[PDB]
Design a protein around this nucleic acid. Structure first.
Lengths: 120, 56, 122
RNA sequence: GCUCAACGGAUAAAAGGUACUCCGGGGAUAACAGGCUGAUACCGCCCAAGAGUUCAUAUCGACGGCGGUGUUUGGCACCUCGAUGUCGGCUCAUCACAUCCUGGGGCUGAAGUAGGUCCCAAGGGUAUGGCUGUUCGCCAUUUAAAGUGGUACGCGAGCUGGGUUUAGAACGUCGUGAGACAGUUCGGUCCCUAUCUGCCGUGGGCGCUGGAGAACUGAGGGGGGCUGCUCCUAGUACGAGAGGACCGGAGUGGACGCAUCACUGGUGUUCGGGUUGUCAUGCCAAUGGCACUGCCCGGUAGCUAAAUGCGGAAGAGAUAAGUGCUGAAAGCAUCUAAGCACGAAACUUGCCCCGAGAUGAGUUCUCCCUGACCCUUUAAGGGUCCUGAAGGAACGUUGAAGACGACGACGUUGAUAGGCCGGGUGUGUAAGCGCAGCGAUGCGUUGAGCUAACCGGUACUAAUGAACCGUGAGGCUUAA
RNA sequence: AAUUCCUUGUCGGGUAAGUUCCGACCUGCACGAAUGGCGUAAUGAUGGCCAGGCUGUCUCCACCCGAGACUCAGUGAAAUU
RNA sequence: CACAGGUGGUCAGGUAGAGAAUACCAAGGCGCUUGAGAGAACUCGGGUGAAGGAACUAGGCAAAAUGGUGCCGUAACUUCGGGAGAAGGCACGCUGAUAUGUAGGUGAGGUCCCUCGCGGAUGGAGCUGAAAUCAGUCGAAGAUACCAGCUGGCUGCAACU
RNA sequence: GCUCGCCGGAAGACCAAGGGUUCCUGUCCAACGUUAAUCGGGGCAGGGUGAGUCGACCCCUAAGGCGAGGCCGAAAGGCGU
RNA sequence: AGGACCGAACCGACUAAUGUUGAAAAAUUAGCGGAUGACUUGUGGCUGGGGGUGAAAGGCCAAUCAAACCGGGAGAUAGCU
């Protein structure tokens, strides 16, 4: 019974869920635009936006927290060097989901997730 | 577990009366490109609400 | 929260050390005896040359539980063990003289006044 | 020349076991359950010898008599052998009333408490364990009570498989033996994805007569209806005492039911921390992966019980057995014939929920549409152009709503979801740095760092201009 | 008694309560001496009984994590009739 | 059947470990030929659980529990071997001193000798290396994970493998 | 291609047995692959297996088989030097 | 030393759950017995159906066993359906 609960199981155990969202957040920070499934993007919001919010104040402790949650020094560097200064004047809403049809293989609803000002 | 009597064409059709597909009610027209698209979905060329937010 | 088959310590000098509840008295299908409730017990361990002896069947009153009592303000008093005080079957007065360990005010009824009087606390 | 005697005479000549089993048949024919019957069984009544301290009928009732049920044991062989799974247990029940408790009452060998028996009454309630495969039974301890029966001795396409009823083995007994035993013992495969009826939930369609949005009435249906103990009246009535009430009133419990999360807790693999082994991020330091969430310690929201609120009613109407008042037939007497008054947890209401497909489709309030032409089998007819209202639906962000439908909130005229800010809660003093110590480690910065679902805010992101369905005053008759 | 019908034989032990178990008895229906009798340390995925510990076996179920169940796209059976 | 099964022999790295167990890794190789959602009943495989603790049941079925090393201690009975790991109790991580690595193992140089070298005593450098006592110290817990006996009593049968 | 996860006394490497072209390249996706398929152990075509030293053959024999003459047996045939 | 003990490989199969139109015409998971011996295993050989083999269960003899399978007598016979 799901009364007032948050988070989608996505038909995975918690370890696989954490690993998948770590990889997907790395991909989104790297490329600034990724095509995924709609619910996966809905959860990638909750995974990626706190990380960019953490990337505002540049400190060693925040770098180590980001590396703990990402396990990619290139992603941590890009966050704290580019996306912190980029979004420093924005109160949340760092991302954008655009629905883009359905997957041919399994008819899954598809969405692009983008950073709100990528300019590419 | 299993039938005793063969059901009929009639009962088959009555059971299938709820299998009809609902066609798309109305497609939305892009304000800039004028393309037809599902509402709240981007166009085939990559437009949405008059803005070209797609790499290709 | 005392059922059938549950072991209780004895908080009196009647002689019994451990007793087992074999019927929760009251109504039909009654499940649990809390503090201040009368139970039917069998003695499983007893000091030699005591008032009572092993195998005896008689009545007892629950005076301490691990489940505890709730007070009207919402507080709970829990104990590290379940203990009872032996009673005569046909008179319901305690067999022993001394009471060991604390009790609660749930025994503040006209029948358990003799337990409350000789209890060391509360 | 035949006890060929099984006497229309199989051969001159012939016994058994099969549970290691087989094949053709039969419901022509047994075991289960069903059917007919009702000897038997159980219950009920008629007579009254007698028992009952005197006393047939308070309570019993011999010798004998008559019914009822279908309920035990049986009788029959009607269905089933091209299969209707057997005993007990668990889960879930449902009716009857020949009532176990609780209610009402007559009599009593009813002084009181407590009982007995009979009549009315089926609303609700109606044990836990030891032994045994058990149903029963004995025992222990309870309860207001632990009712009696029907339902395929209810319930295996719901569970089990202890017992019976396979194949292994052994004891006693029987038999020359193979084997056998209504003797005992140990072991010993229980399939089925639900088409139809039914039932519990939930939708789509059309209808309800112009469309749409709400709010209702309530025909009808379902739920619920249990009870203990203590105190007062009152140590009163009654009683030689021993004991000890009716009626009425108050409190406090057990079981059951609904709701809920304020509290006490459980859970909380989405929060924090400790720690083992190993790999890794170049290395220290710090983190991550993996080992049941590695193993543990706590713990948010939600869900939840053991937690805590509430409930069973009172009242009314018509009555059952019963009690009467007046009162003739029948000058009296009589509860009854006329008439009148009481009378129970049973009935109808009152309590809660569903409820207009209630096709007998109901009522009320509000909103909306007020254009031209052609056509002909003239009609509640067809067609073109203009128009497309109220509203709905669809789509999107979604919910303490939900399997999917459905239902509720919201879509820039915006707090609907995520984010963000502040708080709160949880964990328990992060990392970096400094100082002390040889070192593990400790102290300070520091109740620090981090913190899911929570609370209060905030348009940062996502909820789009549109299109889509839905029309254009709504039949006839009679009457006012 | 792996053997005893009556039988849950009797008495005792253990339990609140013991048709099972242990010990004794002997009216052995229907033990008995290499189809061996009676004991026996050790051994046993062997039968029966009792106790400590342990527990969701149970009172009485609650919450959680995954795989199905449910919806969507693809392919696409069966018994039976 | 592109099927959770069966199929002889050889090879055998690191860390921890008694180990070819077990955990995590290397070389090397794979994610198992339908997926996407949702997060009802119920079923299957697991985690945890207040109070009680076998009241369940035909039966403790199944689960829970025990579980390592060292030292101490160890019953009836017995065929003198056993029973026995009976039962039961204590200790256990990390750091430092003893002792910049101790006891022990290997053993270069160099001395020396030699029927002579791939040589035998001396020597101890370097390398490896238990175990224990004491002192301190962190945690709720030091066998921390995986792995890893439940114990006892009475009795039938069959000696035992 | 980068991350993630699993095995690692195996889910890694190599043989015998068994199989027979499944091996490698180019091309195609009807059918086969429990879905799609550009992919494939699928269809089509072409290519690929080099030994004095590895194995077989070879020389020797074991269990066993066959077996000139022989013994035996209705025939078939059995045994055996 | 041991038909000794604990325990992997290997050989087995006591309990439970699952599964029973199975992943599987006997298996999977968790536990479980033996594990230097009366052990296990590869290659080849021998024993043939009223026969073999059997630490013996009527067990096994190619998913078949109180008398295998194939072909024949054979259209056995069937007072039965």
């Amino acid at each position: 019974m799901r009364h007032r609960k948050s988070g989608r199981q996505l038909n995975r155990n918690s370890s696989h869920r954490q690993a998948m969202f770590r990889n997907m957040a790395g991909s989104l920070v790297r490329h600034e635009i990724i095509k995924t499934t709609l619910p996966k993007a809905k959860e990638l919001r909750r995974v990626v936006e706190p990380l960019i919010t953490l990337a505002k104040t540049d400190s060693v402790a925040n770098r180590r927290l980001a590396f703990a949650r990402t396990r990619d020094n290139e992603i941590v560097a890009k966050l704290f060097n580019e996306l912190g200064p980029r979004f420093a004047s924005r109160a949340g809403g760092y991302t954008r989901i655009l629905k883009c049809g359905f997957r041919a293989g399994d008819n899954a609803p598809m969405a692009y997730i983008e950073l709100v000002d990528r300019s590419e | 577990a299993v039938q005793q009597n063969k059901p009929t064409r009639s009962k088959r059709g009555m059971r299938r009366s709820h299998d009809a597909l609902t066609a798309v009610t109305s497609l939305s027209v892009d304000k800039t490109s004028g393309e037809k698209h599902l509402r709240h979905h981007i166009t085939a060329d990559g437009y949405y609400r008059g803005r070209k937010v797609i790499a290709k | 929260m005392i059922q059938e088959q549950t072991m209780l310590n004895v908080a009196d000098n009647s002689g019994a050390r451990r007793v087992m509840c074999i019927k929760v008295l009251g109504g039909s299908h009654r499940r649990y005896a809390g503090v201040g409730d009368i139970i039917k017990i069998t003695i499983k361990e007893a000091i030699p040359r005591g008032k009572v002896k092993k195998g005896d069947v008689l009545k007892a009153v629950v005076v301490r539980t691990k489940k505890g009592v709730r007070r009207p303000d919402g507080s709970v008093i829990r104990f590290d063990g379940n203990a009872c005080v032996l009673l005569n079957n046909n008179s319901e007065q305690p067999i022993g003289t001394r009471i060991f360990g604390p009790v609660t005010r749930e025994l503040r009824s006209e029948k358990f006044m003799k337990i409350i009087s000789l209890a060391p606390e509360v």
